[PDB]
Amino acid sequence: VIGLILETDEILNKKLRERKQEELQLDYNPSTGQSSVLILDGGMKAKPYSQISSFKDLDFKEDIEGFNKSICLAFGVPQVLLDGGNNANIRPNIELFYYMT
Amino acid sequence: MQIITAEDYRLYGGLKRPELESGVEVMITAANALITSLLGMDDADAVDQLITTKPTRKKYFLSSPSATSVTKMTINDKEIDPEQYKLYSDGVILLKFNPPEGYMDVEYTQGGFNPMPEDLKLAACMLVDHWHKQDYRQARTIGGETVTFNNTKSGIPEHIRTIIEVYRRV
Amino acid sequence: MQIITAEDYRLYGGLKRPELESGVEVMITAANALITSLLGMDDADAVDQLITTKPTRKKYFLSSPSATSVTKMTINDKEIDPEQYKLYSDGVILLKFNPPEGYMDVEYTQGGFNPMPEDLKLAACMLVDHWHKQDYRQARTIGGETVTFNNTKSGIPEHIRTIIEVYRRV
Amino acid sequence: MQIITAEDYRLYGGLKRPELESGVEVMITAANALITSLLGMDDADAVDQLITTKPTRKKYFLSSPSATSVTKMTINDKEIDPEQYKLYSDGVILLKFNPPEGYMDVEYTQGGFNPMPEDLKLAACMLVDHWHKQDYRQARTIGGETVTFNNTKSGIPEHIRTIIEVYRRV
Amino acid sequence: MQIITAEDYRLYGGLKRPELESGVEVMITAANALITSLLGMDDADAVDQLITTKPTRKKYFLSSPSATSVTKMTINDKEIDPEQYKLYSDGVILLKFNPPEGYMDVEYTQGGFNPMPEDLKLAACMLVDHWHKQDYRQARTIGGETVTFNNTKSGIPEHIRTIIEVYRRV
Amino acid sequence: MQIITAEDYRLYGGLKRPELESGVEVMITAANALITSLLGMDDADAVDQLITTKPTRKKYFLSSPSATSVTKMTINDKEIDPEQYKLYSDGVILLKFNPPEGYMDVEYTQGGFNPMPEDLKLAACMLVDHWHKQDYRQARTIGGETVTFNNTKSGIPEHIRTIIEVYRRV
Amino acid sequence: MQIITAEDYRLYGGLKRPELESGVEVMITAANALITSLLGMDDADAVDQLITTKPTRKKYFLSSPSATSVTKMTINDKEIDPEQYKLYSDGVILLKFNPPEGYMDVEYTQGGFNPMPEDLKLAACMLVDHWHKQDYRQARTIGGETVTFNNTKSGIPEHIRTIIEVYRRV
Amino acid sequence: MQIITAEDYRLYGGLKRPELESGVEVMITAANALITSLLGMDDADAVDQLITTKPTRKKYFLSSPSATSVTKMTINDKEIDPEQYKLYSDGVILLKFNPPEGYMDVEYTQGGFNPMPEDLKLAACMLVDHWHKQDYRQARTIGGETVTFNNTKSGIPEHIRTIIEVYRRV
Amino acid sequence: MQIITAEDYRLYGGLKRPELESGVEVMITAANALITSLLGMDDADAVDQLITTKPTRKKYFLSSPSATSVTKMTINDKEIDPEQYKLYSDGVILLKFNPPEGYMDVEYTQGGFNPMPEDLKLAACMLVDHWHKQDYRQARTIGGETVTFNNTKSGIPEHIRTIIEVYRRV
Amino acid sequence: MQIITAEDYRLYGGLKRPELESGVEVMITAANALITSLLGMDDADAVDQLITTKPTRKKYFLSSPSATSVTKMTINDKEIDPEQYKLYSDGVILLKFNPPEGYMDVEYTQGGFNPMPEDLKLAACMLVDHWHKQDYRQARTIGGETVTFNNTKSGIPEHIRTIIEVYRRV
Amino acid sequence: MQIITAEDYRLYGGLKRPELESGVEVMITAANALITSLLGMDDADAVDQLITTKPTRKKYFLSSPSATSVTKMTINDKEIDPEQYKLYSDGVILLKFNPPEGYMDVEYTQGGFNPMPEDLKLAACMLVDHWHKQDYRQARTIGGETVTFNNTKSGIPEHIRTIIEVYRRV
Amino acid sequence: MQIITAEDYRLYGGLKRPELESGVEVMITAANALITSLLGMDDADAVDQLITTKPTRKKYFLSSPSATSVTKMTINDKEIDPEQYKLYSDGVILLKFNPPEGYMDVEYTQGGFNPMPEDLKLAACMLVDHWHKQDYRQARTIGGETVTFNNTKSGIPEHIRTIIEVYRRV
C-alpha cells in the first residue's frame, strides 16, 4: 500500500531523504498527525499513481461458497443444517438428512 | 554560516593581488548566506519550536536534523526530565512514555557542519565565481569565441544545484 | 526598508566618481521598495489585524512572521491580559484558553531583518544593476559580441528570483 | 494620480536641455493615467458604492482598499451612527450589529499613496521611456547592433508588468 | 467622440510643416471613430433602451456605464415619477419599489469622458502613427536596419490593445 | 453602398495625376461592394421578411438592425395597424398583443450609415490599396529590403479584419 | 455566367496591345466557369427539382436562392394554381395549404446577378491573373527578389477564397 | 472523354512550332483519360447496373448523374413500360408504382459534358503542363532563381485538385 | 501485362539513339510487372476461385472485376447450367436460385484493358524514368541547382500513386 | 572517503609540474566528498539506527548495505546476544526469533570499499577534470574549433552519472 | 573481471610506443570494473544468498546465472544432502522435495566467462577508447572537420549499450 | 559461430596487403560473436533444458529452433524411449502419449546454419566495416565532404538490423 509517490530528478541525500520520508508519513496521518497540506519545493513532483492489483479483484467469496456447498454435497448434509433455519427448515431438513443420507 | 571567506576563495583560484576586489568581498558573504538559506538551515545558537503532539506517537521530528541536544522539554507547560526522552542521530527524538495530547515546546541547540564539507565550499565558490564574472546569461559572445551557458534550475546553475540538493535538508 | 544605499552600491562595484549618476540615485531606493514589497514586507512600526477566531483553535498566525511582540489583544471588544497568550518564534500566537467565536483585533510591532542578510543586499544590487544598464531584453549585441539574456520568472530574472523566493514569505 | 512629472523624469535621466521634448510632455501624463487606471485606482475625492447586505455577515469590503474613512452609511434609506461600525486598515468595514437585508450607500474618502512609492515611479518612467523610444516591437536592428525585446504580458512590458502586479489591487 | 485632432497630433510629435499631410487628415478621425467604437461607445445625446424586467429584481443596468441621468422611464406604457428610482454612479439604476413583469423603456443622456483621459489620446495617436507609417506588417526591412514587429491581438497591436481594454467598457 | 469614391481615395493618398489609374477605378467600387456585403448589409430600399411567429413572444428581430421604420405588417395575410406595434432603436419590433401562431410578412425601409463612419472609409481605402499593389503574399522582397506581411483572418488582413468585425452586424 | 470578358480584363489592367494574349483568352472563360460552378450556380434558364413533401410543412426551399418565380407546381402529378402558394425574396416558397405526402415537380426561372457585382469581377480577374502569371506555388524567386505566396484554402488563394465565400451561396 | 487535343493545348500557350513535341502528344490523351477517370466518369455509350430494390422505395439513383434516358428496365426479369418510371434531371429515377423486392436491371445512355466546360479544359492544360516539364517535385532550383512548389493533395496539385473536385461526381 | 515497350518509351521521350540503353530495357518490363501486380491484376488466361457460399445470398463477387465471362461453375462438386446464373459488367455473378451451403469452384477468363488506358502508360513511363536516373532520394544537387523530390506514399511517388490508386482495383 | 588524492590524479594525466595547481588541490577533495555523499554513504566508523520493528518480521535492513557486523542490538532497552541474530552479505540482518513490537537500536561498523574500485576513481577524476577545466556549459567556442557538451542528468555529467548510478546504492 | 589488459589494447590498435600512456593504464582497469559491474556480475569466488522459500515451489533461481555448482545448502539451519537437489544449466536449482516454509542459505561458486567472449573485449576496448579521447561530448570540431556523436543510452553510447545489453544479465 | 574469417572479409573488400590490419583481427571474431548472440544462438554441441510440462499438452517447444535430434528425454527422472516423441522441422517436439505433470529434461544437439547464409556474412562484414571505420556517429566530415549517418535501432544501424531480425530467432 502506498500513500504518496514523490519523485525528484535530483539526488537528495538518502539519510535526510529517509528522515523526511518518515516525518512526512507520520505527520499526515490523522490518527497521529496535525497537518494536511504539502508545499513541495525545489521542483519535487508528486506522481499521480494508482493501485495496480486492488483487493476488490479477488472476489473469491462466491467460489469459496461453491466449494463449501460441494463439500457438504458429497456427505449428504443439507446446507440448512449447518446454518440456522426457520420453523419450515429445521425439522424437514433434519428429516431429510437422517432419512435420505 | 561561514563557509568560504577570502582565504578559501583565494585558494580556489590563483589570485595574485594581495587585496581582494571590491565586488568579491560582499559577494562571498552573500554566497555564504544564500547557501545556508537554501539548505533550510538558520544560523542560530538555539531554537524554540512548537511541535503538536498526539497520543500513540512516541517519536517527534525536530526542524534541524543537526540537533545536538535538548536543553529543556515542555508539554502543556510542565518540564519533563531528560530521562523520558532520548534524541537520536538525526533530529528524531523518541519519548519513553506516551505523551498526552496538547502542544510541545522544546529548546534545542543547533550544531551544523562543524567539520565543513568541501562540497559546500566548492558550491559557494562556484556561486561567487558565477556572480563575479557576470555569467548568469543564456549565452555570451566575445568577438569570435562565444559561450552558451548551462541550464538553470530554480535560478541557480546545474552544478551548484546538484551540490545543494545533495545537502539540501540540514 | 533600506537595503542598499550608495555606500553598499559603491562597495558592490568599483565606481571611481565621487557623485553617483543621476539615474542610479532614485533607482536604488526604488529597487529597495520593490524588494521590500515583493517579499511580503510592509514597512510599518505597528500593524492592526483582523483575525477571525473559532472555538477549538488555540493558535493563530499573524500576517507578518517578523513580529517581535504583540502590544494589545482584543476579542469582541474586550482586552485580554498578556498572561493568557504567548507569541512564539514565528508569527504564531498561542492562546491558553478557548476563544469565544467572533473577531480578533491584535496590534503587534514588526521587527524585520535587524541584522540585514547579505542575500537581499546582493539581490537588490543586482536588480538595480539590471535596471541601470537596460538588461531587460531577450538578447542584445553591439557589433559582433552578442549576449542572450536569462529567462525571467514573474518579470525578475532567475538569480533575483531565487534569492527573493528563498526569502519571499517574511 | 500625479507620480512623475518633468522633474522626476529629468532626475531619472540625464537630460541637459532645459525644455523637455514635445513627445514626452504629454507622454508622462499618459503613462500616469495608464498606471493609475491599471492598478485599479480611480482618482476621486469620494466614492459612492452599492454593497448588497445579507444577515449573518458583519464585514463588508469597499471597492478601494485605500479608503481612509467613510463619511456616512445608509441601509435601505436610513443613516447609521458611526458607533455601530468600524473601518479597519484595509477597505474592510465591520458592523457591530446584523444588517437587515437590503442595499448599502456608503461614501468614503479615498487616500491613495500619500507617500509616493518609487516602484510606481520607475514603472511610469520606464513606460514613458518605452513609448518615447518606440520600444514596442519584437526586435529592432540598426546596422549590426541588433536587440530583441522582452516578452510582453497583457501588452505592457515584463518589468513594468511585475511592478504593476506587485501593486495591482489598490 | 473627438479625442485627438490636429493640435494633439502636432504636439504629440515635432511636426514642422504648418499643414498636416493629406493622409493624416482622414486617418485622425478614422482613429477617433475606431476607438469610440471599440470601447462600446455610441456618440449620441440620448439613447433609448428596452430593458426586460422581472419581479424581485430591483436593480437594472443601463447600456452605457457613463449615464448621467434618466429623462423618463416607462414600464408597460406608464411613466414612473423620479422619486421611485435612483441612478447610481455606474450605469446601475435602483428601483425603490418592486417592478411588475413586462418591458421597460428608459431614455437617458450619456456623458462620456468629458475630461478626456490621456490614455485614450495616446492610444489614438499611436493608432494613427501605426497607420501612417504602414506598420501593420509582421516585419519590415530597409537595407540593413530591419525591424520585427510586435504581436497583434484582434488586429490592433499590444500597446493600443492594453490601453483600449483598460478603458473598453465605458 | 458608396463609401470611398475617387475623391476620398485621393484624399487618403497624395496622388498627383488628375486621372486615376486604370486598375484603381474598378478596385474602389469592388472594395465598396465587398465591404457592404461583408458587414451583412444588402443595398436595398426595402426588404421583405418571413419571420416565424409563436404566441407568448412579443418582440421579433428584423434582419437589418439599420431599419429606420416598417411600412406594412402582415400575419397570416391580415394587416395590423401601426398603433399596435412599435419598432425600437435596433431592428427590434415590439408587439403589444400576442401574435397568433403562423407566419409574418413585414416590409421595412433600411437606413444604413447616413453619417458614414470613417472607420469604414479607412478600411475600404486600405483594402483597395491592399489590392492595387499586390499586398496579399506572405512575404516579398525587391533586392535587399524585404517585408513579411500580416496574418490574414478569413482572407482579409488583421487591420481590415478588426474594423469590419467591430462593424460586422449591420 | 459571363462576368469579365476581355473589356473588363483590359480595364482591370493597363494592357496596351490591341489583341489579348493567347493564354488569357481561354483563361477568362475558364475562370468564369470555375466561379459560376464554385458559388453553386448552374447556368440554365429553368430548373426541375424533387422536393419531398411532409404534412405540417408550409415552406419549402428551392435549390437556387436566386429564383425569380416558379412557372408551375406539381405534387403527386397534379398542378396547383398560383393562388395557393407564394414565393418570397429568397428561394423559399410558402404553401397556404398542407401538402399531401409525396413528391414535387417545380419549374422555376433562375435570375442570377442581373447587376453583376464587382466583387466577383475582382474574384475572376484575380483568378485569371493567378493563372496567367503562374502564381500557384509556395514561393518563387528570380535572382534576389523572392516572394512567398499566400496560403491556399481548397486550392484557391486566400483573397479569392474570401470573396467567393462572401458570395458562395447563390 | 476528349477534352483538350493539340489545338486546345496550342491555343492555351503560344507554341510556334507547327508540330507538337513527342512527349506532349501522349501526355495530352493521358491527362484526358486520367481526369475522366478521376471524376468518376467512364466513357461508354450504355451502362448496365444492378440497383438493389426494396419496397417503400420509389426513387433509385443511377451510377452516372449525366444519364440521358433509360433504354429498358428490368426487375426480377420482367420489363416495365416507360410509363411507370420517370428519369429526372440528375441520375434520380422515380417509380410511380411500388417496386417488389428483388433485383433491378437498367440500361441507360450516358451523355456527359456535350457542351464541354472550360474548367476541365484549363485543368487538363495545367495537368499536361505539370507533367511536361518536371514540375512535380517539392522544389526545384536552376542557379539562383529557385522555386518552391505547391502543396499536393492526393498527388495532383492544389489548383487541378480544386477544379476536379468542383466537378468530381459526374 | 505489356504496357509500355520500347516504342512507347521512345515516343514518351525524344530519344535519338536507335538502340535503347542497357539499363532501360529490363527496367521497362520490370515497371510493367510492378504496375500489373500493384493494381491487383495477375496475368493469367483463366483463374480458379474458392468462393464460400451461404443460403439467402444470390450474388457473389469474383476476384478480378475484369472477368469477361465464366467458363464452368461448381457448387459442392456439381455443375450448374449457364441458364441459371449470369455474370454482370463487374465481377459480380448473380444466381437465380438459392445456393446450398458449401463451397464454390468457378473458372473464369479475365480480359483486362484490351483498350489500354493511357493513364497506366504515362504512369509506367514516369516510373521507369523515375528508376532510370536515380530519382528516389529526398533531395539532390549538382553544383548549385538543387532539387527537393516529392513525397512518397507507399514507396511510389505522388503522381504514380494517384494514377495507380485511380486504377487500383481492376 | 579519500579515493583519488594527488598521486592518482597525476597518474590519470601526464602533469609534468611536481606541485599541483592551486585550484585542483581543493577540487580533488571536493569531488571525493561529493561522490561519497552522492552514492549514499556517510563516512563514519559506526552508525546508530532507529529501526521500527513489527511481529512476523524476521529480516530487517540496516541503513548502509556495507555493514560489517553489529556491535550490539537493543529492542525496547534490552540487549540480545549475537547468537540469536545473524547479519548476511548485504545490510539485511536475519532474526531467529519473532521480535516484540517497539523500536530497535543497532550499532554497526561500516566497511566501504576496502578494495578501492577503479570505477569511482575514474568518476572522481572525471569530476575534477570537469570542474578544473571550465567544462560545465552547454557549448563553448574558441575561435574556430568549438565543442558542444554532453547532456546532464541531475546536474552531474552523463558518463559520471552512469558510473555513479552503477554504484549509487552502497 | 580482467577483460582487456594492455596486450589486448595494443592488439586492438596499432600503438607503436613500448610503454603505454599514463592515462590509458588506469582507464583500462576502470573500463574493466565498469563492465563487470554493469552486466550484473560481481567478481567473487563464492556467494551467499538468502532465498525466501515457500511450499509448492520446487525451483529457485540463484543470483548469478553463471553458477558452476553449489557447495552447501541450508533451510532453517539444517543441511540438505546434494542427492536431493540438482542445479541446472542456468542459475536454476531444482528441489526434489517440497521445502518447508522459511529461509534458505546457499553457498555457490561462480564461474564467469572462462572462455572470454570477444564481444565484451570489443565493448571494453571501445569504452576505454571512448574515454581516452574525450569522446563523450555531443559534437566537436577542429577547424572545419566536425563530428557529431551518437545518442547515449544510460550514459554509455549506442554500440557499447547494445553489446552490454546483449550480455547484461550474467 | 564462425561466419567470416579473414578470407571472407578480404573477399568482401579488395584489400591488397597480404596481412590484415591489427584492428580487424579481433574485430572480425567480435562481430561473429555479437551476431550469434543477437539471434539467440549459443555455440554449443548439446544443450540441457528444463521444460515445464502439463497434461493435455502434447507439443513442447525446444529452446533452439535449429535442434537436430533429441539424445535423451526425462520426465520426473524416468527416461522415455524415442518412440513416444517425434521432433519436427522446427524446435517443436510432439509427444504421442499424454505427459504427466512435473518437470521435463531433454538433451538435444544444436545444428545451426551448416550452409552459412550469405545474409549473415554480409551483415558481419558491414559490422566490421562499421567498427573499423568508426562509422558509429550521427554525422562526420573531413573538410567539405560531410556525411550524415544512418538511423540506429538498438545501437546497430538499419541494414544490419533488418538482416539480423530477418534471422533473429534461431
Side-chain angles (χ1 to χ4, degrees), chain L:
Chain L
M1 283 73 74
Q2 193 88 320
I3 307 175
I4 306 301
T5 62
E7 196 66 9
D8 273 358
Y9 185 60
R10 187 179 317 259
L11 183 63
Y12 172 73
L15 283 72
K16 318 159 174 32
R17 304 162 81 81
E19 314 93 330
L20 264 180
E21 313 188 12
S22 191
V24 191
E25 293 292 328
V26 184
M27 192 95 87
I28 294 291
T29 187
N32 294 277
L34 182 44
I35 294 171
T36 189
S37 185
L38 293 174
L39 314 174
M41 294 299 291
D42 274 302
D43 48 354
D45 275 350
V47 176
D48 186 285
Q49 184 178 2
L50 174 150
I51 298 168
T52 187
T53 187
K54 293 286 198 76
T56 62
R57 194 156 162 226
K58 285 182 173 65
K59 56 185 300 164
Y60 296 94
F61 297 75
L62 300 179
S63 181
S64 186
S66 52
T68 50
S69 177
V70 161
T71 72
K72 76 183 293 183
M73 183 177 176
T74 300
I75 292 176
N76 296 115
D77 291 331
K78 44 172 271 173
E79 172 163 311
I80 301 168
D81 63 358
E83 196 70 28
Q84 301 266 270
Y85 64 91
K86 186 180 289 293
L87 188 153
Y88 272 21
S89 298
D90 277 359
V92 164
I93 57 168
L94 188 153
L95 284 78
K96 302 271 143 54
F97 77 115
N98 189 359
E101 183 178 1
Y103 285 139
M104 183 177 176
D105 191 337
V106 291
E107 293 180 354
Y108 54 70
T109 57
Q110 293 179 176
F113 302 136
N114 194 4
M116 185 63 72
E118 276 60 30
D119 297 330
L120 287 194
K121 286 184 168 188
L122 194 54
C125 287
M126 293 182 286
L127 285 174
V128 61
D129 199 287
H130 175 84
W131 279 332
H132 177 229
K133 260 191 319 162
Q134 298 211 341
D135 271 333
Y136 63 92
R137 275 59 190 276
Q138 276 189 339
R140 178 176 49 132
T141 185
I142 61 170
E145 71 285 10
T146 69
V147 173
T148 300
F149 280 53
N150 189 317
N151 173 337
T152 62
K153 294 177 175 318
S154 66
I156 62 171
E158 288 291 329
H159 48 278
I160 300 149
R161 179 63 148 170
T162 188
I163 305 181
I164 288 303
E165 290 188 357
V166 170
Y167 300 131
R168 198 186 71 74
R169 281 272 161 65
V170 296

Side-chain angles (χ1 to χ4, degrees), chain A residues 48-99:
Chain A
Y49 204 70
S50 69
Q51 212 197 10
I52 310 303
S53 296
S54 66
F55 190 80
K56 264 292 191 53
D57 272 340
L58 303 178
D59 184 75
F60 286 2
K61 177 59 175 64
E62 186 52 17
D63 269 334
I64 294 301
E65 198 70 23
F67 281 131
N68 297 350
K69 188 184 306 307
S70 184
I71 280 180
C72 297
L73 197 149
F75 284 97
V77 298
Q79 191 89 349
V80 169
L81 267 71
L82 292 175
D83 300 332
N86 290 318
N87 286 317
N89 289 138
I90 292 306
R91 197 154 83 269
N93 276 308
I94 279 170
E95 276 184 334
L96 187 152
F97 168 56
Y98 281 94
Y99 298 151

Side-chain angles (χ1 to χ4, degrees), chain E residues 135-156:
Chain E
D135 288 348
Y136 63 89
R137 278 58 191 275
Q138 277 187 339
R140 180 174 51 134
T141 68
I142 298 294
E145 63 282 0
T146 80
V147 172
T148 301
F149 282 62
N150 169 312
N151 284 127
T152 76
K153 294 176 173 321
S154 89
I156 61 171

